[PDB]
Design a protein around this nucleic acid. Structure first.
Ligand SMILES: [Zn+2]
Ligand SMILES: [Zn+2]
Ligand SMILES: [Zn+2]
Lengths: 103, 183, 611, 111, 56, 260, 66, 89
RNA sequence: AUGAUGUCAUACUUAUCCUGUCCCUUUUUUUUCC
């Protein structure tokens, strides 16, 4: 019931709240938003909104590295994602994109 | 023809641009000039939906009638922590306003706009009712003249203004009391 | 105007040429009773009934011969029903001469499936396998066969409805919404059907999706047109798996789009009603008031002649179901467009000489008009009676039964007024009261029952005293229809101011409490209520202490529902008459009864308490 | 004082059964009168004679002893005059005398 | 399929059967499981979709 | 009934408990609630309790705020509003908008309940309606217009019409809009203003709009003119102006020009 | 509204509006005893003949339409 | 879907149930009950005897008009018994 | 310097809503025997 799509208003307010309160207090930040919980706010920070996350096309090196590693440790995305420096969901989407466009 | 249609009316000025497209101009000409009737508001043919917040952001929030101001309620109304609010329930204090029922039986009895020829439209506030011959107080103060404003001395020499030809200003062709030195 | 009789032979010849339909002809001639009033309106209505093309030809030639004589003094639709009944006679006949599994033809095959599919032979040989398959369904099933699996290591395509969201599809609804599943996009009408899947958003999804979708499709009515919509809806509202809610919602979208579309719906009217008429007969009440509403909006939305010319072939349809629900349909449309507009149609129908089923239908229509319109029948009551009267004497039975029943419904909505309008109806009815066995008898008793309050206490004195005999004798029949009728009768006959107490006290009350008060009745609902009312009125006449005094002992009876019944009865009685009449001892039995019954309560309800 | 609202013209039956009230145009109403159980006067519910676009010159009660009451309404129709740009319907249009019949049993008022 | 889904859902419901006011996350769990009873085929399709796709 | 047996402290606690009973999903609950709140308002007296009403956060929509508004009304009745108004009118100042339209509603229900007594307070409310009716946002025009309505029915026949004409000026531009609630509001407004001011002035605002070239203006001014027309059709006669006669038709009614 | 005679709309013609206000004026004249008597005084006739001429002018006034 | 029947107003008194009891019909308000409701027996008959003018339950009281609708004279129009745009039952 | 098209989003309105409600769907080849 609480779950749903993320909104620009909720997302910007999440930016400001994280800026003010700090990274380790989630319950305080979930208090301001409506229809969202603390877990969802944290994972929403570290998954997507976090500025340290790299949003752009993958260079050739990152594709070589991603393919090699994914053939090295099948199906493990949370181990690979830090090694290439990208988000697990992102490198997943890009992998299915490489097999999708490869044929 | 919008030209010749203007010869059939006592006050043909009433005829306007879109008026010539009317389904019955030969009447509307005679109605719109009816004695005491009032014009249609002008906000249509403006697509702006009757208002914007340009001039409306500089307005005061509100100001009370003097009869309500002398009463003294204004100072009584004016902050609280949450636990003080649940204390305000447990403690509670009575009689914060403590109004004088004599006073509020007094003001609205003992103590206590526009005519029909006017109607409001979107942007109009002050202007029509600063004109040639009519100025505000303070600018009188900067001017510093005791109870003509002195450049209507030069409106003697150089002539009546092109911009407001209908002009009359006191003492010249306009034979004045308080602020308003021309009409 | 005798040349409107021989002229009826002429018109019969011409229209018969342009065979045998009695209805349209009597509809044509039905304008004669206004004579010299008749006008161009006859061209309009008939325009829909026959081909609008020949319509200008026939109506034109009619006005010429009419004006001259005065001075000197859809077809395919009906063609289908005829073939339908004829095949029924062929098959039915063959068995004497001797269902959905009957073999089919390639045109019939092309009839079912929609556009864009191909028939295939792969071989002639695999086809010969399909032909031997029947023989080999027996033969090769008796032969060697089996299946097995091997252990070996191991692509998986599938489709939900993806785009952004597309709320979920039940596993069956795929058949309808399959076109949405394929993701081919962005290249005319095919894009309107494709975008029309917003239906799916109305059917299943979140409430907001249903709201916004509903509006979006409302404002696109004029755009998409009724054709594509109904083409993509009527299958859904026809779905065998349909919900309650989903049904109701599709009803809503049909309404909201039918507030706009007016002239457009004309081809689809029947195509609508076929699904909608089942709403009129339903267990749910709100479903019924909705149905009546949307048929009102449809009939008023379309034209009169549209409705009439539309709905004829369902009158003689073999199944009585469609006939019945169709009758209620005519009731609704008649409430829409008014009685006098639709009269000549009916009055033409009940005199149809083809077959009885028609007249049965039309009479049922008279009834359902009586129920629906109710109190408002009053002005045309006379003409209506003048229609229906000819069926009471008919050789067929049904027509007689349903006829007199319709008189009943009339009089019940006729509550007292217009007595003389029923006048000519009486003398046969009373006579029939003598000679009848079975349901028709009870029906007459229903009619006469609702009539008697409308007569004069002098004439109704005699007539009533005659009815009382049969009324007595007939208490004992096991028929529950019977018991309902004779019950309400006893209310009206014996609740008459012109009836004597002692006569009721002796003749009636003992058999009344004997046969009627039993545990068959109370368990039923209607019988419960009506019984309550009748007993209440008998108390209203003979007095209080009698009735109560006889039914007190039953407060202590085992079953609840029975106790509930006598309890609410005592309640209403002592409500009206007052407790002053009650003596002492019976009052002891009262208070003890009421406490005792109150001490055992299986369910929570007011009846015991208010009591 | 209205165009369509009754009270203008007033008529009543010789036997006092039903009183008929009428406006100048479009509305002619009837109240039926019967004394109560105590022989004190009780008034019924109204009825409606409504006839579209019809001017009523005068209304007079009519004598029918213990019958369905009759009423004499002078009428005229201007609907002929409004749709006749020539002005012929201004002339050649005669005021229609119509007798309405109240009917107790059918409890409506028919032309 | 319905058999299996039913069993599993009952199993999950069994941990909370005593059911004090619980908490927020638990509340989400009861409401979502309860959802699964009303529209099972939805839940089954969503599940098979996860099993075919999500690796994170 | 009794109300003396209990000390005031208990009462005011009852108040602060009653405040959140207005979350009820049922209408009869709120009913009894507001009426009680009036009773205890009599048991104590106005100022404190109406202040406790003005405390309200307004936080949710209807479901309800406006019930508190009703309490402000009935409280203003139970002891003379002749006392209470200045507090409210001051509390329109607050920059928070939804409570501004709140106190507008309070005036609406207020005049609806007071009726005749508004023969005085009309003046007090007049300039504030000017500020409100002059539009910050549509709800101001709407609610204020409703106030003009109930005021207009209430004051009828007592001779205050002038200021009502002034307010009618500012009412008049709002005639045009497609929003259902504001257009039906304005309709009720101009109907009450019809009966209070008299038709003549109305019609003098409604003449020119009838035949104006545009379709919009004709749609509306004809809707208005119908509203003015159905009621008081008898009294309109005098006010139809003189309209000259053309070729085929005589548009002068000469009966009025017969002079003795 | 429609069944209420005198109802206007956006397409309303001059002729219809003025013939309306005419007929309504005449119903007022039939209505008020005095004003009627004023008319009888000014132009000398019976009350009757006045009302009769008015009832003649009910359908016509302004004459034929356009 | 829900609108007045507007048949001619008779002498029959209006009947409101528990729910609708206090409401003036048209203004939807509880204020100043003054005059009385009249509807035709065409709208009020039979199962409608003592029926609610609105919901269809038994009438426990009689509707009174406000003073607002009084001066605007709306109480004089056709019988204000709401009919759903299906039947009335 | 506010046009059109978008299933983004949030505020807001209506003393609207949330408890009323089952009562004429009873449809079949007439068929209850001193
Ligand atoms: Zn009615
Ligand atoms: Zn109710
Ligand atoms: Zn009201």
């Amino acid at each position: 019931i609480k779950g749903g799509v993320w909104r620009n208003t909720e997302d910007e307010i999440l930016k400001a709240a994280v800026m003010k309160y700090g990274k380790n207090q989630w319950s305080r930040i979930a208090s301001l938003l409506h229809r969202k919980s603390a877990k969802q706010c944290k994972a929403r920070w570290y998954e997507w909104l976090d500025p340290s996350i790299k949003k752009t096309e993958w260079s050739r090196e990152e594709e070589e590295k991603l393919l090699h590693l994914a053939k090295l440790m099948p199906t493990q995305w949370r181990t690979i994602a830090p090694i290439i420096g990208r988000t697990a969901a992102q490198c997943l989407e890009h992998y299915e994109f490489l097999l999708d466009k490869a044929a | 023809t919008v030209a010749e249609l203007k010869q059939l009316v006592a006050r043909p000025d009433v005829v306007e641009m879109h008026d010539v497209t009317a389904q019955d101009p030969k009447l509307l000409v005679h109605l719109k000039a009816t004695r005491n009737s009032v014009p249609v508001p002008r906000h249509w043919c403006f697509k702006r939906k009757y208002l914007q917040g340009k001039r409306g952001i500089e307005k005061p929030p509100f100001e009370l009638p003097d009869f309500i101001k002398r009463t003294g309620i204004q100072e009584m109304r004016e902050q609280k922590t949450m636990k003080s609010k649940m204390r305000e329930k447990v403690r509670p204090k009575m009689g914060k306003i403590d109004i004088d029922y004599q006073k509020l039986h007094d003001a609205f009895f003992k103590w206590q706009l526009t005519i029909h020829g006017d109607l409001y439209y979107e942007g109009k506030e002050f202007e029509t009712r600063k004109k040639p011959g009519d100025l505000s107080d303070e600018l009188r103060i900067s001017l510093g003249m005791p109870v003509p404003p002195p450049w209507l001395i030069a409106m003697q020499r150089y002539g009546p203004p092109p911009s407001y030809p209908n002009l009359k200003i006191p003492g010249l062709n306009s034979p004045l009391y308080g602020d308003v030195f021309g009409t | 105007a005798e040349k409107a009789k021989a002229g009826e032979l002429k018109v019969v010849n011409g229209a018969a040429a342009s065979d045998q339909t009695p209805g349209a002809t009597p509809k044509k001639l039905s304008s004669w009773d206004q004579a010299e009033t008749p006008g161009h309106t006859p061209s309009l209505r008939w325009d829909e009934t026959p081909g609008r093309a020949k319509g200008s030809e026939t109506p034109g030639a009619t006005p010429g011969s009419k004006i001259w004589d005065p001075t000197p003094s859809a077809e395919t639709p009906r063609t289908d029903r005829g073939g339908d009944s004829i095949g029924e006679t062929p098959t039915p006949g063959a068995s004497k001469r001797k269902e959905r599994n009957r073999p089919l033809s390639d045109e019939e095959l092309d009839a079912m499936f929609p556009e864009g599919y191909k028939v295939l032979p792969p071989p002639a040989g695999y086809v010969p396998i399909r032909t031997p398959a029947r023989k080999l369904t027996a033969t090769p099933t008796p032969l060697g066969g089996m299946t097995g699996f091997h252990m070996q290591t191991e692509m998986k395509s599938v489709n939900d409805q993806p785009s952004g969201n597309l709320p979920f599809l039940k596993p069956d609804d795929i058949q309808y919404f399959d076109k949405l599943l394929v993701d081919v996009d962005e290249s005319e009408e095919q894009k309107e059907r494709k975008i029309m899947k917003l239906l799916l958003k109305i059917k299943n999804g979140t409430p907001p999706m249903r709201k916004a979708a509903l509006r979006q499709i409302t404002d696109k009515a004029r755009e998409f047109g009724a054709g594509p919509l109904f083409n993509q809806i009527l299958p859904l509202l026809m779905s065998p798996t349909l919900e309650d809610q989903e049904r109701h919602l599709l009803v809503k979208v049909i309404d909201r789009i039918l507030y706009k579309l007016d002239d457009l719906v004309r081809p689809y009217v029947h195509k609508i009603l076929v699904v909608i008429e089942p709403l009129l007969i339903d267990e749910d009440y709100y479903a019924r008031v909705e149905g009546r509403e949307i048929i009102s909006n449809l009939a008023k939305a379309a034209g009169l002649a549209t409705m009439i010319s539309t709905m004829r072939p369902d009158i003689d349809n073999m199944d009585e179901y469609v006939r019945n629900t169709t009758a209620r349909a005519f009731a609704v449309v008649a409430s829409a467009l008014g009685i006098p507009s639709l009269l000549p149609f009916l009055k033409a129908v009940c005199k149809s000489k083809k077959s009885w089923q028609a007249r049965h239908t039309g009479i049922k229509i008279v009834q359902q008009i009586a129920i629906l319109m109710g109190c408002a029948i009053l002005p045309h009551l006379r003409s209506l009676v003048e229609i229906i009267e000819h069926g009471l004497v008919d050789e067929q039975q049904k027509v007689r039964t349903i006829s007199a029943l319709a008189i009943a419904a009339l009089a019940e909505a006729a509550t007292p007024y217009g007595i003389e309008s029923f006048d000519s109806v009486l003398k046969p009815l009373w006579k029939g009261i003598r000679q009848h066995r079975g349901k028709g008898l009870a029906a007459f008793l229903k009619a006469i029952g609702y009539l008697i309050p409308l007569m004069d206490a002098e004439y109704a004195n005699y007539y009533t005293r005659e009815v009382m005999l049969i009324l007595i004798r007939e208490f004992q029949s096991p028929d529950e229809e019977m018991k309902k009728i004779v019950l309400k009768v006893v209310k009206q006959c014996c609740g008459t101011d012109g009836v004597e107490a002692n006569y009721i006290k002796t003749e009636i009350l003992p058999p009344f409490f004997k046969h009627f008060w039993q545990h068959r009745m109370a368990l039923d609902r209607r019988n419960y209520r009506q019984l309550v009312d009748t007993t209440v009125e008998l108390a209203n006449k003979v007095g209080a202490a009698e009735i109560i005094s006889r039914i007190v002992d039953d407060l202590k009876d085992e079953a609840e529902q029975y106790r509930k019944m006598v309890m609410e009865t005592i309640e209403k009685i002592m409500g009206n008459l007052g407790a002053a009449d009650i003596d002492h001892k019976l009052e002891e039995q009262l208070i003890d009864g009421i406490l005792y019954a109150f001490q055992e309560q299986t369910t929570e309800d007011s009846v015991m308490l208010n009591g | 004082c209205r165009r369509i609202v009754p009270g203008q013209f007033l008529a009543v039956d010789p036997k006092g059964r039903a009183v008929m009230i009428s406006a100048i145009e479009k509305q002619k109403l009837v109240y039926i009168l019967n004394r109560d159980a105590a022989a004190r006067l009780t008034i019924s519910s109204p009825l409606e004679a409504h006839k579209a676009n019809t001017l009523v010159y005068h209304v007079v009660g009519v004598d029918v002893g213990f019958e369905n009451p009759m009423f004499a309404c002078l009428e005229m129709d201007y609907e002929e005059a409004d749709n006749d740009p020539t002005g012929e319907a201004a002339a050649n249009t005669q005021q229609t005398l119509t007798f309405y019949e109240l009917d107790l049993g059918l409890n409506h008022v028919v032309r | 399929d319905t058999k299996l889904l039913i069993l599993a859902l009952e199993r999950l419901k069994e941990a909370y059967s005593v059911k004090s006011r619980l908490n927020q996350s638990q509340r989400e769990e009861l409401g979502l499981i309860e959802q699964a009873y009303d529209n099972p085929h939805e839940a089954l399709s969503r599940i098979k979709r996860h099993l075919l796709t999500q690796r994170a | 009934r009794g109300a003396e047996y209990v000390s005031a402290r208990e009462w005011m606690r009852i108040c602060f408990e009653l405040l959140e009973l207005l979350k009820a999903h049922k209408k009869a609950i709120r009913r009894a609630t507001v009426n009680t709140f009036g009773y205890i308002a009599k048991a104590i007296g106005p100022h404190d309790v109406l202040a406790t009403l003005l405390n309200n956060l307004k936080v949710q929509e209807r479901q309800n705020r406006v019930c508190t508004t009703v309490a402000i009304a009935i409280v203003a009745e139970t002891c003379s509003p002749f006392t209470v108004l200045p507090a409210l009118m001051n509390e329109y100042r607050v920059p928070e908008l939804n409570v501004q339209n709140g106190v507008l509603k309070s005036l609406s229900f207020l005049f609806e309940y007071i009726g005749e007594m508004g023969k005085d307070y009309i003046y007090a409310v007049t300039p504030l309606l000017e500020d409100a009716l002059m539009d910050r946002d549509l709800v101001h025009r709407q609610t204020a217009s409703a106030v003009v309505q109930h005021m207009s029915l209430g004051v009828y026949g007592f001779g205050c019409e002038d200021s009502l004409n002034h307010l009618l000026n500012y009412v008049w531009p709002n005639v045009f809009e497609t929003s259902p609630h504001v257009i039906q509001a304005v309709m009720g407004a101009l109907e009450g203003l019809r009966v209070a001011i008299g038709p003549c002035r109305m019609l003098q605002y409604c003449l020119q709009g009838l035949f104006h070239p545009a379709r919009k203006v004709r749609d509306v001014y004809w809707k208005i003119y119908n509203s003015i027309y159905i009621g008081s059709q008898d009294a309109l006669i005098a006010h139809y102006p003189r309209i000259y006669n053309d070729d085929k038709n005589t548009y002068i009614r000469y009966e009025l020009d017969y002079i003795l | 509204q429609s069944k209420y005679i005198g109802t206007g709309h956006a397409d309303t013609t001059k002729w219809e509006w003025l013939v309306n206000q005419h007929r309504d004026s005449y119903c007022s004249y039939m209505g008020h005893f005095d004003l009627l008597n004023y008319f009888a005084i000014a132009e000398n006739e019976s009350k009757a003949r006045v009302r009769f001429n008015l009832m003649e002018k009910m359908l016509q006034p302004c004459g034929p339409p356009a | 879907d829900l609108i007045f029947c507007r048949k001619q107003a008779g002498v029959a008194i209006g009947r409101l149930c528990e729910k609708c009891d206090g409401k003036c019909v048209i203004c939807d308000s509880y204020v100043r009950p003054c005059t009385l409701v009249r509807i035709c027996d065409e709208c009020n008959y039979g199962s409608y005897q003592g029926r609610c003018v609105i919901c269809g339950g038994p009438g426990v009281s009689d509707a009174y008009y406000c003073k607002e609708c009084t001066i605007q004279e709306k109480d004089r129009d056709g019988c204000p018994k709401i009919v759903n745009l299906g039947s009335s039952k």
